[model samples]
Target: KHNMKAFLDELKAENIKKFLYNFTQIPHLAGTEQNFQLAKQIQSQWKEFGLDSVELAHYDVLLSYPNKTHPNYISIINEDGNEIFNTSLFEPPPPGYENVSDIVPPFSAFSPQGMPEGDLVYVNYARTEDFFKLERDMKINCSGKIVIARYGKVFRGNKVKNAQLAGAKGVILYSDPADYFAPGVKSYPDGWNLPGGGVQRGNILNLNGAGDPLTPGYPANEYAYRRGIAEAVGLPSIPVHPIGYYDAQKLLEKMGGSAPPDSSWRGSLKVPYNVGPGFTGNFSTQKVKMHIHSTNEVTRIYNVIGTLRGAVEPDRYVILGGHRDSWVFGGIDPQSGAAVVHEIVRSFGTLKKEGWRPRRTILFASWDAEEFGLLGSTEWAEENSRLLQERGVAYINADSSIEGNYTLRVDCTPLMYSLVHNLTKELKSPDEGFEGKSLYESWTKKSPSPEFSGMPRISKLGSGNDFEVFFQRLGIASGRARYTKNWETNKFSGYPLYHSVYETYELVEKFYDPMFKYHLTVAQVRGGMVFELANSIVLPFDCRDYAVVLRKYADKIYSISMKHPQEMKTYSVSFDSLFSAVKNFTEIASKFSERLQDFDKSNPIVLRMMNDQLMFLERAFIDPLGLPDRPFYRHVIYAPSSHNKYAGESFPGIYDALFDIESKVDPSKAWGEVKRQIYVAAFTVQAAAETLSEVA
Candidate 1:
């Protein structure tokens, strides 16, 4: 039995690294022929690996792409409107990868095609607060101007929306040297830092919702009713483009305005930071502009799924997922995650040969169109909503298996925090210098949770990956595990060449995971979680731990509301009902744990009933109508914040409504909404407590 884990430990890194190289050999952007073929290839490999069943699932979705023939570009025009300097739309392939020519051109996905020209204004990061500061404090207005914002702090889509809401005509996005390249770091092809022409490409759809904009809260399939683009939800109306730091330097140096009042707004570029509304010097009469030729089309995407049947509980499923689509060669994004899944499944196939069988079914999903707003996963989850709501046990995701050579990072729902905490202790550290130390020990040393008294912190899940549909919408317990760079030291959003052409196999082999040991460690730890979930007699869940986390969230909510005591008093807001609900749930959860003390594990009936309770515990939080105006996000406890989709908010409904009170037309209207949310939360939590109170 212990030999199963030992088998994963014995697996060589060479084979996994080879798989990574093979998957990233070409660009496989969503809805493209290469991406379709990759889905078929993954299906074939899973069948060959002796999976019980494999299927190439299909969904017809609306996807956006730039015009291949006429690449989108930005130009520097003189006063005469004659193009002086033209920016490159695509990066040249690295040394050995010159043969790979199908790299996707750099453009913000879902941006409407229109050239909006105006004077340039530098807004750092383009966060909502930055825009607020520019207008209120700096006395600089963004109306009728094209804004240049560096990439960091928030989702690229939110950044674009921020500019649009601030009355900017167009948006130009770029990576700053301060974030992408540290003070003295060497560029890629030499070190991990990005090169001058390395552009970061991503989607810019409104973050208010997710999935196919045409089909909200439903599957995008052949017979599904699709809405017109004019009525779509998350599509952007402005033209947005991404350029490299090299191009950014050119534009910033030509700007004319007041110097940035705050030094924190400055980047590593040598040009003086200016809050410009127009150009200066020789190009003073010229205007900055963008050219976006992207189109939105309804296309077919595939999700290849492989299943291994269980000996006893084939209906119960433990899913492991990774996306197959890439922005370009995705060496550090989906490919790394895909390689980890492939290697884990291959190792599981070896276990089948030794007569090993899981207690619950296991599924390996090679999700497509993930880069395009998690289309494949979202559609599939909606299509299979009935089965998933009833039978899905848990979902484990590996979006980018090894982002850096440092410690492991795990983000999970509160129900699985203890499980993740225990498993990391069982695996050895992958870093070279950390000998005789477990990953948990190394993780504690590197990054410990101040909230948990030095315990290795596991983050709460947020939207951005394939796990969103499962955890956020269906209320399935979910987790994602990956290794990351020393974030405190590196300070980059992700690795240096994130979503760039320079994210090649060589980059990983030379910089990220030289020996691929961290990749192997992710495989081992992620594989261990899968095995435990599939083989355990009793579901490995701790309701008391969840209750504790809930209390913390409740406390945080109260603290945040009281930070402005006058506002709370004016709104007449009280979290006393929410606190009572949390306390009731906590006491009930303790009783439920006590019931499990000496249960008859020998009886299948008792065990099955007990497991069912644990399975439905998370499902109890689901509100079919969903959070406020966002129907796609059904989980009340954890959902991505509307302001910043990358940041997770606990009790999102009440939290968001509370934040909006001051901005409301009638402050009473906002207070009413906040009070309603508090009532809903109390009702929902009390319902969960009632569900747990029943006899097994």
Candidate 2:
């Protein structure tokens, strides 16, 4: 405990910014030499800190990069059979970013090279329901048209997939000012706002599962068996492009269909919102053309691993990680996270000098190719799959450290809920003068919840970052953190120039968290969390938290059953088993908590058994049989939606698996599948209860 406090005191905000400056000046797009350079730098730093082990674990995996020579192009044709406006679908360097001409041109990953030409159609966010709305429009036929979608409220991949599902030939995604521009903030070069010409570059690789395309369920090592490109189910099936709102505005301005779109479909642009697959005034059928040419190459990626061996239990693992790769300079997306990790190592080094060591081993990783598809971390995990599944205690992840400093955004497994709550209670809050106020107090006052002790709700883990691989694929308990501006306020504020060239140190130093206090504060929270978990006599897990979380999910199930009684004709088993499991776990956990008061803090045997129970309990909830389609991702409670990669569905078997079944089959079969999955979930919960009961 003293070690943790010393580590916190050792952390310097300026040091964090110094590391950030080191990383943020240049682009380090995944699979490039730049990314490899960064990886080596991280490895060397860990060695300097006197880490027990530091290695650059390499994996040969497939990745996509824009064919800069033949860049993607967008054109809006005139009624006179000519091009009115055309430009390479790429972001020119924002005023200060002229030095970064090597920026990856705007192109969607996994989009096959093609020139898809058709009239442009606007499909709001290009969500499933949005596509359905497009189908109802009377005049325009959406089929064979190219779609224009704004990026917000959903993953960019979902937008592309939905458009492809709607029979659109191609799709273009752009960040809308409505979502990116705060109410009164100036854009980049002036403030933290997204420049009008900034194009948000991202991957649209169909994240049906985690890891590399060629190696689905295993590591993409040299000896691993590989699948052919045609067999890779995770790759996107359609051609897609990304553009700045500048190009989007021209195409949208010409799309003057008579019908105004659904109010929800309206963007912040000051023009009539059109649901047009045809431009007005005699424009031809192929008025819009989206041309894309990308180079998909099988390349090598790196993951730098640094270990601090435990004084007591070396086998028990607590992992901390963040991706080092970025689409641009990535000042905020990843380098901020890089800086946080560096500062963490620095503090740990200070403790090491004073002969302080954790009870359980901690692994710090800087992952590469995370921008592409979480390839680096996923491969490493799969490489050590057996060991990690057997001995791993927890995975704590943060990607972007300080986008804005309004509140701490955490999405974690249910098992960590109370532990996280207690930690918040320990830390002082900055909202009120950082003196005499706890972070828990400020957070609750800023926004209170009815349950969970006025704590912010722990959300479900979804895809789009590194945590999904651990939580979903390996069934490891993981927590992800994000900090955005005043979540309680009417409008949400954040660094809007995401995945663009404007995400530089200047943005962080001038507009977002200018004082760097919030940066230090976040590092403090994460640093303390890692220390407590690694050093605690007990694993600090609360069994009742899962019971409470499961009960809420069950209530949701009951509500669904009531609403769709005819469709919820479940099988022979009852939810009684799940309730019994919860009751059993609550009692056992209470007993365990009471026992903690009496047990020797450093009793080797007791700690080992207790840690074993805590680690395996998370695994117990994972069905070895795995999710129906995604056998690799077997976590019953938290799996990313098969359809929407960014949204996690609780009780996924019933939520997504059932929906998938129903969409293709009749009501009876769907209900049967739902019931079957519910039983699986219940059985998994029961098994976990039995494990905790035995452990105590």
Candidate 3:
């Protein structure tokens, strides 16, 4: 305890200085070659810091850089031959398109390089519902029209896919400034602003369908390689691109025939936001150049493995990690947490050097390509899933640290709540009056305290970070920790520069927390948590909480089904079985907890069984065949919300299946998938319960 205190004191001093230094040094952006290089640099740093092994795990990622030379675009014009608008107003057109005259050219960034314009039609967000509505009510054939959609409601990729499904030849996504931009909101310089000509570039590949365009239903291996471009499932069928609100305003203003949008449909543009058929302009694009470049770059990206090497149960493991990749200089999005990770490593290293070691192995990893959809961590986890499932105890993750003093949030296995609660007590709050105060207390005290005193609850793990593979695919007990103090006053203010060029040191120092004091706090909290988990002989997991949450989820589904019987019939068996299993598991878990203190920690068989139970608890929730329509993702209980790509919470038994029920069109077919998911979740809980019983 005294050594731990000394370690903390030293950590407090070193972490603050190191955080600022690291923040200044590590400037990461999501989709750049610089990000890849930075990943390597961090791996080297980890090795230098005395980590056991620092290995760079590389995966194939399709890197699409801006085509500045061959700008593929289209021009909009009236029937009278007057140029309406073009994105390339400041610069001359690309080599091939300079001579083609008449219409104003379209934005090139997100647009497909090849598209022949016929007619133009307006679609609101191009959601699946919108397509269904258009098909049933309007009966409008949009066969040859360029579908213009508002940028909201669903992911850009989903929007593009929906338009293609509805027989549209091309897709144009435009920003609606009305909701995004208003008067009181300080535009651009003062806050996050989508400038006039700026276009949002993103992937339009169908994520729900498959992963790794080249290899579907199987891991990408060196031996089974290469397929025709046409065979690849990753590419979008129709061309798509983003347009600024200014350009959208021009289009909306000239649109003559369509009905004016509903009150809710109004945008910030001065002109009327309408569903258009009136605006007709010549639009054409050709793939100026095409080549299949090798994405196979021999690069090294590291996963820093830090181990205390368990004293009692050396083979058993508890892992904690967060990615270090960022788009440009990801101070808010990732570096904020990266700094904390380094601080934790330092704390662990210091303690270990001082003769303090853990009972179980604890590994700290700094993953790469997290921004590109959990690439590094997922591949690593996938490669070692079987071994990890045998010995791994729990995988806790902290990503995107911020300078906020809010209630502590936690997402973990039910068994770990007590451990988490005890840990929370040790953390000093930024505020004096706040109960269960921790590092967040400093930030929370700046404003009036909320009525609730305990740290805010931690949210469940989902896609977008390194935890994706661990929690969802491997079924490891995984959770994410974040601080959101600044968000109360400055909603998304801290993350405006996310995935953009503005994520620089200057921006973080000026607007975000300049001092980097919070970085130390994060280190202390995360480092301490990992330390305690590692040292504890009996793995901390709360089956009671697990059963409670699972039961509650089942109840919710049941209630939903009761209200909408016909719609929810398919999920009936899944829900019933899940509820029954929860009851049985609760009894089993209670018995296990009662006997936990008496278990033989020294016995290899008992320890092995306990570790197996902890690791397989999550895997029990996954369906080997994977979720319906999204086979690449195997977890049945929770997944990233289809609408919110990077943002996720628990979404059970409902993927595209929910769409069928809501639409009232194919409720019968949808329930089978829903049932499969619920069964999987129940089976997972039962397995954990049985394992806990055996260990007890």
TM-score of each: 0.97, 0.94, 0.80
Question: Which lDDT value does model 3 have at 51?
Answer: 61
Question: Which scores better on TM-score, 1 or 3?
Answer: 1
Query: In angstroms, how far off is 469's CA in candidate 3?
Result: 1.5
Best candidate according to TM-score: 1
Worst 10 residues of 3 by lDDT: 285-294
What tens digits encode model 3's per-residue C-alpha lDDT throughout 1-696?
634456556566345445645654444434445666766667776666656666665555333334535555445644554545554332222223334332122332223356355456677767766766556766666776777777765556667777887787787777676434434544343554444543443456655534445544444444546455567654666677656666666556655445544555565677655555545232222111111111222223445455557667777777888877654445455676777777677666666666666778877787765654455566567567676766777787867666343434445655566676666556666343654655444433443334336444444454555766666666677765555543343332233233433344444455545555445556666666677667655566666777766676667666665666654543454466777777988898777666665677677676656656655666667667766556656666677666544445454554345444655656655566666656666776676567667642
- Of the two candidates 1 and 3, the one with more favorable lDDT, higher being better, is 1
Where in model 1 is the C-alpha error above 4 Å?
Answer: 1-7, 207-209, 488-492
lDDT by residue for model 2 (1-696), tens: 556677788899899889999998888988889889989988998888868889999999989887867777777765565776785556667666776657888778888888877777888877776765667644456678888888876777778777777788888887778778888888778878877788777788775655898888778887988888888756777688877776677778767665665577777887676777677665544388667788788998989999999998888889999999998888898988889989999888778767888898999999998888888888898889899988899999968887677777677887787787888888777664556888877767665665756567557777778877778878788887656666533222234888887888888888776777778878887787888889887887776677777778877765655555445445443456656766776777677656655667668677677778777778887777888867777888777776567777777776764453435546666666667777787777767778866442
Q: Which ten residues in a row have the lowest lDDT in candidate 1?
A: 486-495
What is each predicted model's overall lDDT from 0 to 1? Answer: 0.85, 0.77, 0.57
